[PDB]
């Protein structure tokens, strides 16, 4: 087991696999009952002495484009090279692996923007060892502010007790802030259903397919969250210390509920394409009815205007009581009988 | 034997007998020429082109002691690649894709490889192969192929084939990133057909490369005694390259599938637009056609003649009928 070999790359190099290369920041929280210390360091040396520190520490590394920092931390903290590759590898599915010394966790974040129904994916990775939590994230802006302010306020049992509660706090915050985005998407789809029932315009297909792809990505993310929480809860690895088995069982139930919700909502979404097809088919039927009636009334009338509009040397014109109004009345009668037939058949 | 190869034109046999000191090239067509070269202790390379000549490949196979089922599997051309393990020899079959410009199709060539002792054997459907780089390396005394055994040569052949897979993927990438904008911005009559051929090529590549990944994984994990232990990391590297290729193929297929389903969903709106155009134009120009046809009449007595400005008046009323028919629409936004 060692770094995978890539054709384009040189044999040993590790490459970032993302789009965000704008910002670099490190946040280190050494929180404890007696006191806590917070500080931001632009360099990687300051986090190294906390490898074997007894007090729990929480290192937030923002900006993984700097592969130098990540593999320096990995060499210093004993992280295996393949775990480093998967930390850099954003294009990934959430998963966890158990080692002799550390627990590696992969699970993604999603953000949503108004007026643009785009679902992002931020690769945030967690490393649990000794009493340290190592976090690698793509860009500034996180979902863990409530846990940070809870630590700063000293409220909650997470500050008093061990760091496995810190890992649980991070994971619970991530699963919780899935729900802000989920609520936003549910409101968006409800209002969108409102317009599609009101106005079935051209953009509806594009928006519905965008939402369908969004749901596909959410399913491809949520389904790996089980077999992750599954391993954490059932497998009870030694680093858990068995104190937090219900704090993993509840998240198991939460993830199962989310997976069931996405399974239901996929069919809910497909029904929207079904409804749109219904509406467009009905509109096409209306257009057919209008065109058919117009042609049906006005073609025999063109028969009259052509047959009697012929020019011939000996035509039986036979003017009877100035029969030109008589022919006009004949056309009127045939038009009336045709429109009556259409009304009876209920095309119009 | 049962034969299903497409081509019959060419047939040629090539043999490479090279050692750490000297190398020799031989060009011939007789079957018995390669028979003495099998006994050579140094690793040897056999290139046989033309599967339609069943008799010569047969005589070679029974000379080498190859089981007839392997021979008939080689005769089979339309099968998924798969690797066989036997005590006397290891059996491998692969694929050889070729891509072309100005016309977008996939051409696959069946190739099979059998490795026994210090002997390397393969059968080619036509002349020309992707294995030019390894031949050039051997001819000009480069690399470390000569120092190692024949299993390293088998490695070299496989990695040359995966290199040509990468070369194919680059052209596929160009085509997909041009069709992306072609579908999104400027649809055409044949854009749909281009998307279908692209998806066909991609699904064929996926169904071909998954067996290749399985074959390389089996070679790496099983580590058969015939292939030396020291050459297993190279096979693992080729397996990783195949993983790369598979991931690329899956991403490309997803992109093409999205390009398909968006367009396939827009077709109902397309139909509505076309028939709206037809209906509006027909319903505006049929009543006017009748008005002109019936007022342009050839009965003897015309009340139209007596009316002053009759022709301008009928033209004006025809225009206002056209106007009211136009404004009949836009109430449902038909126009």
């Amino acid at each position, epitope marked *: 087991k060692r770094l995978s070999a890539k054709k384009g790359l040189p044999p040993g190099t590790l*490459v970032y696999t993302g789009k965000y290369r704008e910002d670099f920041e490190i946040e280190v929280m050494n929180y404890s009952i007696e006191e806590f210390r917070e500080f931001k360091t632009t360099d990687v040396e300051s986090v190294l002495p906390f490898r074997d520190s007894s007090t729990p520490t929480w290192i937030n590394i923002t900006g993984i484009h700097r592969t130098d920092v990540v593999q320096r931390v990995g060499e210093f903290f004993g992280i295996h090279p393949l775990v480093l590759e998967d930390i850099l590898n954003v294009h990934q599915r959430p998963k966890v692996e158990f080692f002799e010394n550390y627990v590696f966790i992969v699970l993604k974040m999603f953000t949503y923007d108004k007026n643009l129904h785009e679902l992002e994916s931020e690769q945030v990775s967690l490393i649990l060892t000794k009493n340290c939590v190592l976090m690698f994230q793509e860009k500034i802006g996180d979902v863990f502010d409530p846990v940070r302010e809870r630590i700063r306020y000293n409220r909650g049992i997470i500050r008093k007790k061990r760091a496995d509660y810190l890992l649980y706090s991070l994971i619970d915050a991530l699963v919780d802030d899935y729900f802000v985005l989920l609520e936003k998407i549910d409101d968006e789809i409800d209002v969108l259903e409102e317009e599609v029932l009101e106005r079935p315009e051209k953009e509806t297909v594009q928006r519905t397919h965008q939402l369908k792809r969004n749901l596909v990505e959410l399913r491809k993310t949520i389904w790996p969250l089980r077999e992750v929480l599954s391993s954490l809860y059932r497998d009870v690895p030694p680093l858990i210390e068995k104190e937090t088995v219900p704090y993993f069982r509840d998240v198991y139930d939460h993830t199962i509920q989310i997976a069931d919700t996405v399974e239901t909502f996929r069919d809910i979404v497909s029904g929207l394409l079904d409804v749109y097809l219904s509406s467009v088919s009905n509109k096409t039927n209306e257009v057919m009815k209008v065109l058919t009636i117009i042609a049906t009334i006005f073609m025999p009338l063109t028969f009259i205007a052509g047959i009697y509009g012929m020019n011939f040397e000996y035509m039986p014109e036979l003017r009877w009581k100035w029969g030109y109004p008589v022919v006009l009345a004949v056309m009127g009668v045939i038009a009336v009988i045709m429109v009556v037939y259409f009304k009876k058949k209920k095309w119009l | 034997l049962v034969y299903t190869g497409k081509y019959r034109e060419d047939f040629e046999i090539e043999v490479m007998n090279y050692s750490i000191e000297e190398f020799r090239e031989f060009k011939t067509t007789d079957v018995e020429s390669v028979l003495p070269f099998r006994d050579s202790s140094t690793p040897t390379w056999i290139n046989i082109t033309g599967i339609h000549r069943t008799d010569v490949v047969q005589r070679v196979g029974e000379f080498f002691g190859i089981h007839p089922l392997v021979l008939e599997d080689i005769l089979n051309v339309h099968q998924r690649p798969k690797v066989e393990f036997f005590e006397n020899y290891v059996f491998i079959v692969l694929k050889m894709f070729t891509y072309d410009k100005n016309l977008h199709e996939l051409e696959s060539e069946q190739v099979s490889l059998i490795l026994t002792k210090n002997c390397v054997l393969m059968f080619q459907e036509k002349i020309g192969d992707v294995f030019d780089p390894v031949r050039e390396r051997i001819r000009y005394n480069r690399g470390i192929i000569r120092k190692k055994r024949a299993d390293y040569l088998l490695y070299s052949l496989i990695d040359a084939l995966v290199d040509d897979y990468f070369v194919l993927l680059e052209k596929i*990438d160009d085509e997909i990133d041009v069709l992306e904008e072609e579908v999104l911005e400027r649809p055409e009559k044949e854009t749909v057909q281009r998307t279908h051929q692209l998806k066909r090529n991609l699904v064929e590549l996926r169904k071909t490369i998954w067996p290749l990944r399985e074959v390389l994984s089996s070679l790496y994990r099983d580590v058969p005694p015939l292939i030396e232990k020291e050459t297993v990391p190279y096979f693992r590297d080729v397996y990783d390259h195949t993983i790369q290729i598979a991931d690329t193929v899956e991403t490309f297929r997803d992109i093409v599938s999205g390009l398909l389903d968006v367009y396939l969903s827009s077709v109902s709106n397309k139909t509505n637009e076309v028939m709206k155009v037809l209906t509006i134009i027909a319903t505006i120009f049929m009543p006017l056609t009748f008005i002109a046809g019936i007022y342009g009449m050839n009965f003897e007595y015309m009340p139209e003649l007596r009316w002053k400005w009759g022709y301008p008046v009928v033209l004006a009323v025809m225009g206002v009928i056209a106007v009211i028919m136009v404004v009949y629409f836009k109430k449902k936004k038909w126009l």
Partner: antibody, heavy 122, light 107 residues
């Protein structure tokens, strides 16, 4: 903070040899790739060599293949280009570059020279 | 050896005029195309990498795109700082080659 400095360039008699150098400050050579780009006066940039001290892999331009040797040492955090069998066509203003790989597809990667040197003329 | 042919050889425009610099690849380079600016007597600076991504710190007015093997570096509106030589670089292989260059000078 980051600075990439190259030195050792100067006047050379044609047919001779000249040993270039490159010193890196703020970043470690072991975690990146070091290139060399030369620009003859009034001409376009021409890539000549590339080195990765982590593995020692070397890439050489076919225009100048064999006339150049490139390597780096982790002790002094430096890289250098050694010149052999020089001629008139080798005259240019050589550059030291730092490049990082980026991901575009699972099969293909790319290179981008985001930090360069100040420039030395040979 | 993927030689890159860059057009136009020479061009001139005034401040505020949108321009485009097109690069052509003889062979297929997937998206490994980068753009640099070289002021007279200065080190080149990375602007666009992967043919579509702007390097950090570059003004957002610069933009590049890919059309198959057609790579175009377009400027929303030239500035006094933007009258220089721009280069097209392919990074598909270990052997990496530059373009000829487009020289921009004030009208």
């Amino acid at each position: 903070e980051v600075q990439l400095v190259e030195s050792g360039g100067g006047l050379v008699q044609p047919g001779g040899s000249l040993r270039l150098s490159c010193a890196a400050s703020g970043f470690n050579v072991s975690y990146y790739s070091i290139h060399w780009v030369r620009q003859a006066p009034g001409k376009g940039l021409e890539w000549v060599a590339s080195i990765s001290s982590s593995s020692g892999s070397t890439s050489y331009a076919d225009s100048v293949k064999g006339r150049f040797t490139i390597s780096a040492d982790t002790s002094k955090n430096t890289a250098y280009l050694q010149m052999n069998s020089l001629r008139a066509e080798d005259t240019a203003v050589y550059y030291c570059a730092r490049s990082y790989w980026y991901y575009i597809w699972s099969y293909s990667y790319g290179n981008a020279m985001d930090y360069w040197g100040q420039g030395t003329l040979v | 050896d993927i030689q890159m042919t860059q057009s136009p050889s020479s061009l001139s425009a005034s401040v505020g005029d949108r321009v485009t610099i097109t690069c052509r690849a003889s062979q297929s380079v997937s998206s490994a195309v980068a753009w640099y600016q070289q002021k007279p007597g200065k080190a080149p600076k990375l602007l666009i990498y992967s043919a579509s991504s702007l390097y950090s710190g570059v003004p957002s007015r610069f933009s590049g795109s890919r059309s198959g093997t057609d790579f175009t570096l377009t400027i929303s509106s030239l500035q006094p700082e933007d009258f220089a030589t721009y280069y097209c670089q392919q990074s598909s292989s270990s052997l990496i080659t530059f373009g000829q260059g487009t020289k921009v000078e004030i009208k």
